Symmetry: C3
Subunit: 104 residues, 3 copies
């Protein structure tokens, strides 16, 4: 399992939700944050409001989650953000105590 | 070392704190977020307020942290949340600069 | 690539930003959280406001990021916080779709 963490423009959250829902990814966690990226060009940078979306998915769904977020979050301009993929070794359902365990 | 990340109902934070404290886990980080899970049944789902609790513990304490959060955060109803366990390779104490390093 | 996660005193955020900027680390994500550490001594502990800073850097930059945060965030007193280093397997630029992939 992997956690896919996207830091995106706040006005794009709804699009990203819809794009993920349509591929069958409804569980997520959303946090309000501030971020800045690294920019190229003559300088002459504040932390801006952004939205963090986290989904934990099977290994075989990562490409598809990342494609959905990229398609729906991108504008083509600096500040679109980044997606990070991080290993999750165990995912526990609190309601039942059942757990998923990462492949060896 | 592992980071144990629980996304739980906000009204359960105090119970989860107490349950962790009693097993000797006092250090944590708490973030206000919004989340939704995936539900089963006839549809005919907003992001709700939730609370994220993170603790970084030794490899040998993960089962015990996860048991404490499950016992104290569960209600038996949809929306209880999830716990994710993620590898931490290094944990640095800012006050002293000392670090813990994961097993090879 | 690694994600370096620092939970620091809020009044130290600007110092930590400057110290990271000067070493060439401008991209970051900042979240307002609450935390407490574990303390030594006669008891006789609330969650306090803290600031989470995340940067995702190349494997070869982790020591340098961690040194910069420790130098600029430390006061020598309990409550300075912790830095966690977590594996990132893929980092995707949303603007272009290009990705960085961790070493095998």
């Amino acid at each position: 399992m992997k956690m896919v963490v996207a830091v995106i423009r706040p006005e794009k959250l709804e699009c990203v939700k819809k794009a993920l829902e349509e591929r069958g990814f409804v569980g997520m966690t959303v946090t309000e944050v501030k971020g800045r990226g690294e920019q190229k060009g003559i300088r002459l940078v504040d932390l801006l409001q952004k939205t963090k979306v986290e989904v934990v998915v099977s290994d075989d769904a990562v490409d598809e989650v990342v494609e959905a977020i990229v398609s729906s979050a991108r504008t083509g301009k600096f500040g679109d953000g980044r997606i990070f993929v991080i290993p999750v070794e165990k995912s526990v359902k609190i309601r039942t105590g059942e757990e998923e365990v990462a492949a060896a």
